[PDB]
Amino acid sequence: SQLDKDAFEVLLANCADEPIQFPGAIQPHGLLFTLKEPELTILQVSANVQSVLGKVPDQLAGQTLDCVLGAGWAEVIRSTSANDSLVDVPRLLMSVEGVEFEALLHRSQEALVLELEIQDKAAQSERTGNMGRMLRQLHAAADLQTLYEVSVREIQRMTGYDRVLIYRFEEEGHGQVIAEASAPAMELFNGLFFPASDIPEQARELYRRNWLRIIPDANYTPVPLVPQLRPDTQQQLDLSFSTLRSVSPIHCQYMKNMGVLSSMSVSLIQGGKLWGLISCGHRTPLYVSHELRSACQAIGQVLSLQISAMEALEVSRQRETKIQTLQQLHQMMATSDTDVFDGLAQQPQLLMDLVGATGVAIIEDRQTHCYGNCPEPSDIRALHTWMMAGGEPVYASHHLSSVYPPGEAYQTLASGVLAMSLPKPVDNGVIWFRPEVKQSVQWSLRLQPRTSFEIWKVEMTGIATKWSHGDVFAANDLRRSALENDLARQVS
C-alpha cells in the first residue's frame, strides 16, 4: 500500500493541528443518528446502518425516526428527549430486528445526536459491594504513591485489562507514568516521560470535556457519516461529546506498536485542569458494558477528589517546615557575625532544604563558599555579576541556558538558580542550584514509547523543576530577614 503509506506520512507531519473533533466517521461498534429536536428528522446517518437493520443509508436521510426503529421506540425517544437537558437519562434499551441496542443522547449545535451502541450477548450485586471495597481502600491510603498503586490495582482487578497506567501532566505539559499495574510477561512502563506533543491540544481539551474514552478495537475501519456535512448548518458534525468517535490513525498505529488493541482512558480533572489520565490497555479486542463504564467513571471522579485533597494537604505540610526553617534561620542571622550572610554558611543543609536544591553558594566580597553539588567557583563568580545586573531582589529561573548563554557548561550540575542580594555595594548574596530533571529519570521506530522518551530527553534539556511559590517566598522572606539584621548593623 504505497499510496496509503505516503498519505499516512502527510498526517504525521501535521498532527498538532489535525481536527479530531470532526472526524467525519464513527467507530463500528454502534450507530449514530442526527435528529432535529422538534420533528426527529434524520439529517446524518452512519454507513453501518446497512449492515445492521439492513437499511440503505443513501435514501434514509431526510425521513423520521420511526421509519428506522419503529413507532414505539420513536415515541420513547420523543418522551425522553422532551426538554430534559439530557444530563440525567436512565439506561435505555432497544431491540430492532433482533439486535440489542443501548441508547445514549446529547445535543450538539441545536441537533440531537443519538448513539445506538451495540450490546453483544457474548459479552453479557457484586459491583455494588465492590464499590464500597474500593472506596474504603482509597480512603485508607496515606501517601500519594500508595494511593496510585492501590488505584491501579483496584482498577485492574475490576476491568481485567492487561495493563493499567496512570499519567501525570507536569507544568510544561509533559507526561509521566507514575503508576503501573500490568499483567505478567509484558513491558514495564513506570518512570517513562513522553512529550506534550504526543497529546495534542485538541485531545487534551476533549479529555478535559469527556470523562471516558473507549477504543474497543484498534484495527477498525472508520464508518463514514452520510451525508458528511450537516444539512442545517452546512458544516461537519461536532463529535466532541460522542463515545462513538473515530480515532486518529496516528494513535491507532501508536497503540498497535505498543501491543494494545483495546483502550479505555479515564480523565482525571482537578480544578478544571487535566491532572492526568488512567489508561487501560488490552492485547485482544475488548468491549466494556455500561455496568463497567459507570464504575470506571466513578473511579476518576473519586480519585480526582482524593488526589486534589491530598495534594493540598502536602502543599501545606511542606511549607509549614518552610516557615519553621525561615524562623529557625532568622535566629542565626544575628549570632556573632560581622556579615549577615556569614551566618548561613554554618548550616548549608538547612539552607538547601528551605527551598529545595542540591547546591548552595554563599558569596561575600572576594570569597565564595561552595556547598553541595554546585558549579565551579569561577563559574559561580561569573554568574553572580550578570545575575544581579537587573537589580531584582530574588531572581528565579528553571532554564538558565535560555537567558544565560554561558550557562550550558553546567547543565547537569546547575540549571535552575535562585537569587538573593542586598542593596549594599559590597559583593554579597546566596545562590541555590537546582539540577536537570533528566538526571533523575531512568527508564529502560517512529511511534513508540521508547521514541517519545528520546523526544522528551531533547525537549527538556537544561530545564529544572519550576521554582514553587513557596520556594520563591522562602527566598523573598529570607531576603527581608537578612535585610533586617544587616540594616540594624547600620545603627552601630
Ligand X SMILES: *C/C=C1/C(=C/c2[nH]c(/C=C3[NH+]=C(/C=C4/NC(=O)C(C=C)=C4C)C(C)=C\3CCC(=O)O)c(CCC(=O)O)c2C)NC(=O)[C@H]1C
- Name the residues that contact a copy of itself, by CB under 8 A: 88, 90-91, 127-129, 131-133, 135-136, 138-139, 271, 291, 294-295, 297-298, 301-302, 304-306, 308-309, 312-313, 315-316, 480, 483-484, 487-488, 490-491
**Residue 433 grid cell:** 542550584
Min CB(289)–ligand X separation in Å: 20
Q: How far apart are CA 372 and CA 351, in angstroms?
A: 11
The item of a copy of itself, ligand X, none sharing an interface with residue 271, based on CB under 5 to 8 Å by kind, is: a copy of itself
Cβ partners under 8 Å of residue 52, min gap 6 = 31, 99, 118
Within 271-408, strands assigned E span: 273-282, 359-364, 367-372, 396-397
Look at the alpha carbons of 130, 135, 141, 146 in this order and tell me if their dihedral is positive or negative. Answer: positive
Min CB(46)–ligand X separation in Å: 18
Min CB(76)–a copy of itself separation in Å: 17
Yes or no: say if 431 and 384 are a contact pair by the CB < 8 Å rule.
yes
The item of ligand X, a copy of itself, none sharing an interface with residue 9, based on CB under 5 to 8 Å by kind, is: none
The item of a copy of itself, ligand X, none sharing an interface with residue 480, based on CB under 5 to 8 Å by kind, is: a copy of itself
Output 96 or 141, the one with its CB closest to a copy of itself: 141
Yes or no: say if 416 and 400 are a contact pair by the CB < 8 Å rule.
yes
Output 64 or 210, the one with its CB closest to ligand X: 210
Cβ partners under 8 Å of residue 30, min gap 6 = 115, 116, 117, 118, 243, 244
Min CB(236)–ligand X separation in Å: 16
The item of a copy of itself, ligand X, none sharing an interface with residue 312, based on CB under 5 to 8 Å by kind, is: a copy of itself
Output 12 or 305, the one with its CB closest to a copy of itself: 305
- The pairs formed by 18-23 with CB atoms below 8 angstroms and a separation of 24 or more are 18/200, 18/202, 18/248, 19/202, 20/200, 20/202, 20/203, 20/206, 20/248, 21/202, 21/206, 21/238, 21/239, 21/240, 22/236, 22/237, 22/238, 22/239, 23/222, 23/239, 23/245, 23/246, 23/248
Output 158 or 277, the one with its CB closest to ligand X: 277
Amino acid identity of residue 479, one-letter, is R
Q: How far apart are CA 303 and CA 183, in angstroms?
A: 22
Min CB(168)–ligand X separation in Å: 11
Amino acid identity of residue 425, one-letter, is P
Binding site for ligand X (CB under 6 A): 12, 15-16, 20, 167, 175, 177, 189, 192, 194, 197-200, 203, 207, 213, 247-248, 250-251, 254, 265, 277, 279, 447, 449, 452
Output 173 or 200, the one with its CB closest to ligand X: 200
Min CB(303)–ligand X separation in Å: 14
Output 317 or 366, the one with its CB closest to a copy of itself: 317
The item of a copy of itself, ligand X, none sharing an interface with residue 344, based on CB under 5 to 8 Å by kind, is: none
Query: Can you tell me which residue has the cell 463504564?
Result: 293
N-terminal to C-terminal alpha carbon distance within the chain: 87
Min CB(368)–a copy of itself separation in Å: 29
The item of ligand X, a copy of itself, none sharing an interface with residue 365, based on CB under 5 to 8 Å by kind, is: none
Cβ partners under 8 Å of residue 137, min gap 6 = 150, 154
Output 212 or 441, the one with its CB closest to a copy of itself: 212
User: Of 317, 277, 318, 319, whose CA–CA distance to 300 is shortest?
Assistant: 277
Task: Assign 371 to helix, strand or coil.
Answer: strand
The item of a copy of itself, ligand X, none sharing an interface with residue 251, based on CB under 5 to 8 Å by kind, is: ligand X
Yes or no: say if 211 and 243 are a contact pair by the CB < 8 Å rule.
no
The item of ligand X, a copy of itself, none sharing an interface with residue 197, based on CB under 5 to 8 Å by kind, is: ligand X
Output 202 or 308, the one with its CB closest to a copy of itself: 308
Output 175 or 407, the one with its CB closest to ligand X: 175
What strands, in cross-sheet order, belong to the sheet with 416-418? Answer: 367-372, 359-364, 428-434, 416-418, 396-397
The item of a copy of itself, ligand X, none sharing an interface with residue 248, based on CB under 5 to 8 Å by kind, is: ligand X
Q: What is the DSSP letter of 352?
A: H
Min CB(26)–ligand X separation in Å: 12
Output 224 or 372, the one with its CB closest to ligand X: 224
The item of a copy of itself, ligand X, none sharing an interface with residue 485, based on CB under 5 to 8 Å by kind, is: none
Neighbours of 218 (CB within 10 A): 20
Task: Assign 65 to helix, strand or coil.
Answer: coil
Output 49 or 218, the one with its CB closest to ligand X: 218
The item of a copy of itself, ligand X, none sharing an interface with residue 247, based on CB under 5 to 8 Å by kind, is: ligand X
Min CB(89)–a copy of itself separation in Å: 10
Quote the Cα angle for 101-105-106, to 5°: 160
Min CB(393)–ligand X separation in Å: 40
Within 223-310, strands assigned E span: 223-226, 229-230, 235-236, 262-270, 273-282
Min CB(207)–ligand X separation in Å: 6
